[PDB]
Enzyme design. Sequence first.
Site, short mmCIF file in Angstrom:
data_model
loop_
_atom_site.label_atom_id
_atom_site.label_comp_id
_atom_site.label_asym_id
_atom_site.label_seq_id
_atom_site.Cartn_x
_atom_site.Cartn_y
_atom_site.Cartn_z
N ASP D 26 17.78 32.33 30.93
CA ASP D 26 17.29 31.48 29.83
C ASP D 26 16.01 30.79 30.38
O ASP D 26 16.11 29.89 31.26
CB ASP D 26 18.35 30.41 29.51
CG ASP D 26 17.86 29.38 28.53
OD1 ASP D 26 16.78 29.65 27.93
OD2 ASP D 26 18.55 28.31 28.32
N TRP D 51 23.96 29.23 38.33
CA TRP D 51 24.80 29.67 37.25
C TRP D 51 25.15 31.07 37.39
O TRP D 51 24.30 31.80 37.90
CB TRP D 51 24.85 29.13 35.86
CG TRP D 51 23.61 29.80 35.21
CD1 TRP D 51 23.75 30.75 34.21
CD2 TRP D 51 22.16 29.71 35.43
NE1 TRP D 51 22.49 31.20 33.85
CE2 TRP D 51 21.55 30.54 34.55
CE3 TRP D 51 21.33 28.97 36.28
CZ2 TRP D 51 20.15 30.63 34.49
CZ3 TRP D 51 19.91 29.03 36.25
CH2 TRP D 51 19.31 29.88 35.31
N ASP D 70 16.85 28.58 39.71
CA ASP D 70 15.60 28.11 39.14
C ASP D 70 14.57 27.79 40.22
O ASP D 70 14.95 27.28 41.31
CB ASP D 70 15.87 26.86 38.31
CG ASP D 70 16.52 27.19 36.99
OD1 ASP D 70 16.54 28.42 36.67
OD2 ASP D 70 17.01 26.24 36.30
N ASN D 98 23.87 28.14 30.33
CA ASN D 98 22.46 28.38 30.69
C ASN D 98 21.40 27.51 30.00
O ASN D 98 20.22 27.75 30.20
CB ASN D 98 22.07 29.93 30.79
CG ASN D 98 21.86 30.62 29.42
OD1 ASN D 98 21.81 29.98 28.40
ND2 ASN D 98 21.73 31.97 29.43
N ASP D 99 21.80 26.48 29.23
CA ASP D 99 20.75 25.51 28.76
C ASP D 99 20.46 24.43 29.79
O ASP D 99 19.49 23.69 29.65
CB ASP D 99 21.12 24.81 27.45
CG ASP D 99 21.54 25.78 26.37
OD1 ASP D 99 20.84 26.84 26.18
OD2 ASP D 99 22.62 25.52 25.75
N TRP D 102 18.93 23.70 36.00
CA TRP D 102 19.69 23.83 37.23
C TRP D 102 18.73 23.68 38.38
O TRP D 102 18.65 24.57 39.25
CB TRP D 102 20.30 25.23 37.26
CG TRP D 102 21.54 25.33 36.35
CD1 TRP D 102 21.69 26.06 35.20
CD2 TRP D 102 22.79 24.67 36.58
NE1 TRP D 102 23.00 25.87 34.71
CE2 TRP D 102 23.68 25.05 35.57
CE3 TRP D 102 23.23 23.76 37.57
CZ2 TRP D 102 24.98 24.53 35.48
CZ3 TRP D 102 24.59 23.33 37.54
CH2 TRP D 102 25.44 23.71 36.49
N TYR D 113 11.32 22.75 35.09
CA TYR D 113 11.74 24.15 35.09
C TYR D 113 10.44 24.97 35.04
O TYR D 113 9.62 24.82 34.10
CB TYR D 113 12.54 24.46 33.80
CG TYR D 113 12.86 25.93 33.71
CD1 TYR D 113 13.98 26.46 34.32
CD2 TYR D 113 11.94 26.82 33.06
CE1 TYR D 113 14.21 27.89 34.29
CE2 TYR D 113 12.16 28.19 33.03
CZ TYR D 113 13.26 28.70 33.65
OH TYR D 113 13.43 30.03 33.65
N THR D 116 13.05 31.61 36.48
CA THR D 116 14.40 31.93 37.05
C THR D 116 14.42 33.22 37.86
O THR D 116 13.82 34.18 37.43
CB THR D 116 15.42 32.00 35.95
OG1 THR D 116 15.46 30.73 35.29
CG2 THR D 116 16.85 32.37 36.44
#
EC number: 1.4.9.1
Lengths: 376, 376, 124, 124, 355, 354
Positions: D26, D51, D70, D98-99, D102, D113, D116
Amino acid sequence: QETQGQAAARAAAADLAAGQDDEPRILEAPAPDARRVYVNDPAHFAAVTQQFVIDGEAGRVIGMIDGGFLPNPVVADDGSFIAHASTVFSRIARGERTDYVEVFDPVTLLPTADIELPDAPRFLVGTYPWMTSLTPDGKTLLFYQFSPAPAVGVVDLEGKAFKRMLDVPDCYHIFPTAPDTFFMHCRDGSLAKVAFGTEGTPEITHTEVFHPEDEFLINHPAYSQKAGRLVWPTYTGKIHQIDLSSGDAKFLPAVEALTEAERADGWRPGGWQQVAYHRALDRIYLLVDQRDEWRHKTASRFVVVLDAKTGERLAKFEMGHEIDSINVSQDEKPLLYALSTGDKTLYIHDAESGEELRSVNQLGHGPQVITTADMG
Amino acid sequence: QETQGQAAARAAAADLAAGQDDEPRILEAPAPDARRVYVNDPAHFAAVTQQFVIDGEAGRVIGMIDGGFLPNPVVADDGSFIAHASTVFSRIARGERTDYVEVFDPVTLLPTADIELPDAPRFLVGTYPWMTSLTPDGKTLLFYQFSPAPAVGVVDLEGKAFKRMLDVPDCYHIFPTAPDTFFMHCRDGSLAKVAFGTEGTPEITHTEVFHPEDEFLINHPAYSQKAGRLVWPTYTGKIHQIDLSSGDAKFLPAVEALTEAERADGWRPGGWQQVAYHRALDRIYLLVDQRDEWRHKTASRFVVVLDAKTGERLAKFEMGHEIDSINVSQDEKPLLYALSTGDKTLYIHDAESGEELRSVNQLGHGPQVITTADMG
Amino acid sequence: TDPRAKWVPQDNDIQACDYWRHCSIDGNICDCSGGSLTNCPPGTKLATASWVASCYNPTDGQSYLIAYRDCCGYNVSGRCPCLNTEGELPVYRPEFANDIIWCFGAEDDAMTYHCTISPIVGKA
Amino acid sequence: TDPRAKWVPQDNDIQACDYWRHCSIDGNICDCSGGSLTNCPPGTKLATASWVASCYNPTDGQSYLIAYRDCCGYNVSGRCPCLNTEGELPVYRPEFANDIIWCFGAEDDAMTYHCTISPIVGKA
Amino acid sequence: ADDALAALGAQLFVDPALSRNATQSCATCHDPARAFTDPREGKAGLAVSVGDDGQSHGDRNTPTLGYAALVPAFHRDANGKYKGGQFWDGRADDLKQQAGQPMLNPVEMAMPDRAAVAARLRDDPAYRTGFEALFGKGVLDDPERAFDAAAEALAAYQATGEFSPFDSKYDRVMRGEEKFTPLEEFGYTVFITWNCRLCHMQRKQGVAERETFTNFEYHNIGLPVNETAREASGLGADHVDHGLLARPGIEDPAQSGRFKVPSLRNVAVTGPYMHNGVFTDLRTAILFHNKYTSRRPEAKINPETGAPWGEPEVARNLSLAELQSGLMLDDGRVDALVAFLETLTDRRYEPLLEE
Amino acid sequence: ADDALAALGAQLFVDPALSRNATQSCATCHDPARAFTDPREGKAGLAVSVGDDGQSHGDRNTPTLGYAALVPAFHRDANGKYKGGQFWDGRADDLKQQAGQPMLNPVEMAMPDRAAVAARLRDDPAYRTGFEALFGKGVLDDPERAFDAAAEALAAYQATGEFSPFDSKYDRVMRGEEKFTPLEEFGYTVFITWNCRLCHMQRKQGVAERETFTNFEYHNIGLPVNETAREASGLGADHVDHGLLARPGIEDPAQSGRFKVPSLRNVAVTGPYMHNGVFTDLRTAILFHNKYTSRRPEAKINPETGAPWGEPEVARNLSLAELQSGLMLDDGRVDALVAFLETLTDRRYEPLLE
Ligand code: HEC
Ligand code: HEC
Ligand code: HEC
Ligand code: HEC
Ligand SMILES: [Ca+2]
Ligand SMILES: [Ca+2]
């Protein structure tokens, strides 16, 4: 028929032709009303973001508010203010982090409070409306912290000061029911009641477990604080309803938004804000489409409407666009708002016929969240 | 002719099948070379912006740098560092303003200096490369201030400290020729040579006037510090050249980038960085198209290449896309870089045949500025 | 639209890039973010500085001086972006130059660009 | 390109959103901004949190656990955006959610962010 | 009738018998050969004027009467901005209410009272004919009717084309008869893009039919006391000129220190400048408006004296919103603005520009 | 042949003739009934073991020999990290170099020299037979060759299937013979998504063929002294255990206080925990790693004492990058981790789970 931009050209040419002078100045937005709607654009995780303030009746942008990284918006149900919890950094997305709450006047949009939150306590996550919440009196803002451990921050809006963090169990979301009480949802499937004073450890009470571990409750339940009604769908469209109006949780019979036939044919909710609730009418609205079971965050092209007291289907609308989130205005003959992240457009429908009336485009980079005030 | 994403999938599958282990980590960019190209994205005046570091030979993003409101990028000619002058605010786009310069390591991309500039003195304008410039030793960065009165700020990069502002006349742009000297262009149609020290009135000497008041010199001239060559097109594709290699201005014969017949049929340069200059080949590249005379900032679809000594046309390339800015690599067999603001794509061409070789898309919201190092 | 074609003003819709008073706008039309043709949106700050163009009004066949002003102190609105350059000169003739962020004089020293208003100041 | 259709992994291009390892990504693929399938771009900070998803590999017919990481401390890259959600659960089962940003454990307390990476940690 | 009333005002305007010792007419201080301002030197130079006793000085600079008839009567508009009126403090509603004041002011024409003015008018057989033709028999035997009649006539004369001809170079250029030089055009450009247009233009937007380069509002731009004029006036070292707040019936302390925005027409020939005549040169008047723009040493110094501008006589209610423009005028732009402001000189005063 | 060498090593491993007073064998402290660790109670509980003389206690907890055969020989990797070796401080390069050390350590088996080991070997006809068949006639007559050959056999025995059978629930689940319970599966998911996988997993990425839940590196996690074990060991209140910096030839001050990451196979049955046996319960061992994550009680307070953990023995070179994760384990995730770690118990020790 005549668009806004066209009526504005006609008015300007007439002022010019007639010699009407006017001083250039800063406008105030019109008074908050039942048809004001707020669209937040988290911008696909960008470091700065935007909120659009919209008159739903005209389909007109009437103001904007800038926010930082993944802000949480709130709107006082009485129209007296708006606020958000936001996050900025000293060098764009790097350096010293500041988390803070701003309160804004709803007509001038000027900040009337800027309240710093110590130790960078906000949960940074794709935007969930119920991760930051106002108490019914509008005097306190509650926000969720995930790191290092679940907690809820208490911000005094009246005295403009952060007060303290309340430590909680393995729980998520904040549904405030009184000046000093809110509910959360636990990993184990129960709801927790959190009662808190000015000083001291909060009092924390759990309900019975209300869903099994293999039933998945979405990140975007609808909550009507004035109704005390929590409407919580699962991935299959089964709809939990919790009545919190007595101060305690009463679990209502669950309803199915989709038929056995439709479910076996691949109908499932999908989107971001998948569910809406109209208090006066007591009605649930749900974004659904035919989809694989793990495409739950994709756009949906249909809305089903159902009576909350019986679970009877009242309507099923073909929306005509790829819709990610919905909400409704809380007046009589409500508007049904249908936001498309991909089109960056808010489509505005009559909630009874499902017919599209107007739309507002160019709403930022990836708009996702619709908020309305329940002023009735 | 497998793409970069396909070569990577094949390499990852081979490692998986081989059982090869590798530690996830932070990469270094490859060493700076002649074919490195930087694209800046002013993002249509957004409060935050991005720069993309690109390997032009592979057509691959190798890094990025974040910036604030309308930053000015510079790149040392020898590949030793890059830097920007940038601007942030305490709450996204309002509150206390801080202007600063950052210097970055060209392979780790980490900030090696953060230098505050006092009293918010940067000139906030759609990005013109020669509004912030390095002296040829790379020890001093010079930037332009417009408000309250024209001035040049002096930043000591070796000592990491702001030095002073210098008052200058009604002049614009900054073309450094020596550790203590730069040229500017004056409203009155002359250049001004400014020689300054750490304190005291700078020695300011004007050249003769070299153009009339109704010939308009674009905001994006090309300047090759190593050749001392200032290449300054007008709105009609007349090109002024000034040789500053002696330390004083020498005016070279003007050349016409378009024929009389082309000019009569409405050919004119247009875009943002309309002109490039290749030092080792002594060649000028100009973005041109058929256009109305006040559409001078629209994209163009053709590039004319001409010998700088004679004005003879060497080629006219059909670019096959809507191009706003061009530059070239400064090595032998150079690449011609063609950036489309509307496609958000850099197209990389062979500068000899004009053939499109590869492209890099998704470059931000409205990328406008291409910068390369002259490492030769 | 052919972007390189001569610009053709109209006097029937202020939200379009070809509206006659927008002949030298660079940015976003304030009417699309909650202002009006000549007023800023709530929360923004009206600059005192301006830039001028001479813009032909197809309604009365006359050219008018438009002294544009910026509304400042917010990130760029992103709605009704337009860039026109009728009579627009380079930055060394700044009174006619539109790439400069003309937010000087705005309250609270606001300098970020949100949108631009288009008031008439005289006949050319 | 039907968004609601069952997702079909491929093993031939890591920059496409249907590459097999991205089954619960995501954000943005780090290979498109100067990193690689399992490395962060320069200037960014690799988080230590993760995750997990079980991602089927069409080439060898095995399912692998991908524990996504991330790259933090930069604004979002804007290149190769993708959102897949195979086996993705809601926030209250966060190991599979996944929202969440992380970015925990990243050097310098980096929390914004950028993109990923998709490393394999096990078989499923 | 309307012609005749103005022709009566024309006689009165030049008649010294309206002053106690008979030395002084409106035209003594508003001299038609100097755009209706005072060429005479007193104890403060040209800053303030000397009355009919030959010794009393006023405390404000005598303004031009040109274009005064375009000013709206005094009122408070929609925005709570006071606008219009006459005198630098707007204490007279309109021209008719202002005209009787110089006549009875003991520092100016110094007539003892309305009866004494009536008696002077009655002495002249031509006034008896011309007043009675317009206002009725017996008008001059009744001091109140006579005085009110003289003021009507004077106001009617100031509303003629003689005072407001619109024949400056600026007007010819606007009609398409002439073109600005590059420098005058640059100065016009600067005037309409910098802050000058916010105060010295009739309208906030749109186009004015008869521009007089003033919005008729009241602003405090922070001027210091003119010390030589204030000594000549005899009002005292401790006197404060409160501008608009001194108008009877204004009580709002936010009005203290605000004066009426002057028309810039004929500004090039009506030095010295400001309500107390404190600056000799037009360039200096323009540069004073830079005072609040920036923090630069240069902005704080009066070029005529080599010293700071001085502390404001009223240091509150400054028009900082307009003045703190963040752009200082460079010498090139002040040259251009002077060239432009010279084009606002009426044709008949062009010969005066050289001097 | 290598059956043969290992079969000799099996003999030696339970022979108390390798201790000075014949009171103890390898199997006394590495008890096969207890995943090759020490069930006996001394002056510091099960924290440290008592040697052949009946009084001397060591200063470190006796580790499992299960899976020790999978550890690479000591080396410095290209990333500057030391890896592999044997002992909690990695001071022996491999199993062969380690085997002779307890035999000659006066607080363990306490043989006075290699000549004394050879003399006991030579007195046993089965050892004369078995050693001469693998190493040559007279091997037991030369002390250096005898001692080296005894070390080789013991190392060979420890490298058989017996010590590393790979038959835990986790192994059966990975082979798709069975499934985790819900709680075990939640535990596994936490293990591989939280920081545990950064230290207690063989590889940085990809799939390990024979996973033993350690990357073989050296880390200082900031453990306090175990006061009663320190007392029992006799090394003195002034002693500091510098971990890896104590290995001869290591001089780098950044290695001070670092210890080899333990394999977590059989961890549920090998308490107490850490290099000094300081925590009795598996839950406490896990919560200890919560220490650098939060100010809440599941972080600052040792549940076994109700008091704060206590100052690190070595306050520098803490693995803060890995440990300051920003996330604190709550009690439910600690419960789930315990359930998962229990699945790493070899089939034959399932009855000890109890
Ligand atoms: C000098 C002794 C004067 C004589 C004789 C007259 N006036 Fe004058 N006038 C004088 C001054 C010093 C001022 C400013 C005073 C103040 O308090 O502001 C004025 C002002 C006027 C005005 C106002 C113009 C404007 O505000 O823009 C008018 C209309 C005017 N004066 C007319 C006038 C007439 C008609 C006179 C003969 C009756 C007359 N003035 C005499 C100085 C002197
Ligand atoms: C309102 C805030 C103003 C702005 C912006 C400008 N001017 Fe001004 N000006 C103003 C006032 C209120 C006054 C009179 C002040 C007093 O108390 O005396 C003035 C005066 C002038 C003058 C003198 C005119 C005369 O004495 O007859 C000149 C020449 C003048 N102003 C020019 C000028 C220019 C060129 C400006 C833009 C740079 C400008 N002014 C701005 C009010 C305001
Ligand atoms: C109790 C008195 C012991 C006897 C008898 C033996 N060992 Fe042991 N062993 C003991 C301790 C206290 C330690 C740790 C010491 C330290 O400084 O770290 C050990 C360690 C080992 C190891 C290393 C395992 C690892 O690091 O993971 C091995 C391979 C080992 N021991 C084998 C071994 C053999 C073969 C023995 C008979 C010769 C033997 N040990 C005796 C405690 C005791
Ligand atoms: C590297 C920084 C590590 C991380 C992350 C985790 N652990 Fe760990 N663990 C580590 C070391 C170096 C040690 C030995 C410390 C010492 O000096 O003795 C350990 C120890 C354990 C133990 C006890 C094992 C035994 O005594 O044999 C357990 C149960 C353990 N570790 C579990 C564990 C879990 C579940 C983790 C994620 C929450 C985890 N550790 C993180 C190194 C590191
Ligand atoms: Ca004067
Ligand atoms: Ca142990």
